[PDB]
Write a protein that binds this ligand. Sequence first.
Ligand SMILES: CCCCCCCCC
Lengths: 74, 78
Amino acid sequence: PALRLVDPQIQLAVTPKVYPIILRLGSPLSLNMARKTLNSLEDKAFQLTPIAVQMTKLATTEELPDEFVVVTVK
Amino acid sequence: PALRLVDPQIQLAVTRMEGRDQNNVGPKVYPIILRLGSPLSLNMARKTLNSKAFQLTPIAVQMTKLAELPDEFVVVTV
Ligand SMILES: CCCCCCCCC
């Protein structure tokens, strides 16, 4: 269990207002940024450059912000 | 398993912030595509007074299965 906080560079936008992200990880998570910049003479492909997400196991509950979103993975 | 596109209701906001300090570009918002191996819940949380306690408001993510993908988007892989 052990709720972990996502670094402030990765936040959720809900419609807008942007919220910190808390993870209740039951399964590992991956994050890839996709862009259509693999360009041929007629087509274009997607390149998946993975994003490194710094996660911090929440030390004490009093570190939690006043409002945030919680992503729970079974 | 399969791929689901989350509507612009929910999107991921990435802030580079830097190798010069930008600090004025702010966040860049990308549509989310999910590669669910196991299901995902998303609850908004707000602090309610106890003294320690948070008011969890659920959020219905209306993900749509593709068979139409934008040029820029992130892929959440579980
Ligand atoms: C780094 C955690 C990303 C949060 C996943 C977004 C799920 C939206 C339904």
